[PDB]
C-alpha cells in the first residue's frame, strides 16, 4: 500500500526538476496523487494533485503555469516538473496518496532538489512538556472550515509526516486514542494525554476542503522539559 519516489536531483537555476512517484498497494486509478514540498526549516506547501481524469491537474494560486503534473495509468508512476527553479526552491519534495476532499494517509520518503483567497492556518509555537503530561494544541483558520475536511499529522525530523487525525476528530491508521481530534469552524485541537517520549515531533494542521491553495499550518514543536 506504500509508494516509492525516484531520486535526488542537484539542478541548476533557470532549468526544471523531474521528480518521479511509482506505486503499489490499491487501484492507482480511482485515487488522487499530490505534491507537497518542505522549504529547509519551513512549513509544507501543497503544488497540485492528480487523478486519471489527467484534465485533473490543478494546482495553488502560486506555482501555476511553473509547475507541470503527470501521471500514467499503466505504469502506476505520476511525476512533478518545477520550471524556472531558484534559491527559494530549495526543499525535499514529497509525493502523497489524496488531496481534495481526502486526507494524506501515506506518503512518499521525499526526493531532496537542491538550487544553486486562502484559507490561512495558524499553530500555537514552541511547546516543552515532560512524559505523563497533557498536551493542548490549537489551530485557527482565517475562515470557518466544514470538519469533514480538517486533519493532523505528526513529523519526526528525517522523515515524511504521519496522518494521526482525518475528518477533524478521526483517528488515522495505527492511531491511539490518547490522540484525540479538534471540532468547529475556526478553533480546531489536538490534545495529546498520557504523553509519551515518541509523541515528541513537530505537529501539523490541514485545511483540505476547497480553497484552490489546499492549506498547512506553520508548525508546533513539541518538546521534552529541560536544557
Known amino acids: 500500500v506504500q509508494l516509492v519516489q525516484s531520486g535526488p536531483e542537484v539542478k541548476k537555476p533557470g532549468a526544471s ?4 512517484c511509482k506505486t503499489s498497494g490499491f487501484n492507482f486509478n480511482t485515487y488522487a496523487i499530490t505534491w507537497v514540498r518542505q ?27 511553473r509547475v507541470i503534473m503527470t501521471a500514467d495509468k499503466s505504469t502506476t508512476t505520476a511525476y512533478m516538473t518545477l520550471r524556472n527553479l531558484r534559491s527559494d526552491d530549495t526543499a525535499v519534495y514529497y509525493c502523497a496518496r489524496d488531496s481534495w476532499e481526502r486526507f494524506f494517509e501515506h506518503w512518499g520518503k521525499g526526493t ?25 494544541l490549537s489551530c485557527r483558520a ?9 486533519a493532523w499529522y505528526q513529523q519526526k525530523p528525517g522523515q515524511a509526516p504521519r496522518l494521526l487525525i482525518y475528518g477533524a476528530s478521526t483517528r488515522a491508521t495505527g492511531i491511539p486514542d490518547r490522540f484525540s481530534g479538534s471540532g ?3 478553533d480546531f485541537t489536538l490534545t495529546i494525554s498520557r504523553l509519551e ?3 515528541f515531533a513537530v ?9 484552490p491553495p489546499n492549506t498547512f499550518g506553520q508548525g508546533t514543536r513539541l518538546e521534552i522539559k529541560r536544557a
Open 17 to 20: 526538476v523531474k521528480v518521479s
Open 39 to 65: 522549504a529547509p526549516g519551513q512549513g509544507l506547501e501543497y503544488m497540485g494533485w492528480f487523478n486519471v481524469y489527467d484534465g485533473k491537474t490543478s494546482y495553488a494560486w502560486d506555482f501555476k503555469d
Open 112 to 136: 531532496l532538489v537542491t538550487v544553486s483567497e486562502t484559507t490561512l492556518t495558524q499553530s500555537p509555537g514552541t511547546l516543552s512538556l515532560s512524559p505523563g503530561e497533557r498536551a493542548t
Open 142 to 150: 482565517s475562515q470557518t472550515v466544514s470538519g469533514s475536511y480538517l
Open 184 to 186: 468547529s469552524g475556526t
Open 197 to 199: 517520549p515518541e509523541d
Open 203 to 211: 505537529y501539523y494542521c490541514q485545511q483540505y476542503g476547497n480553497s
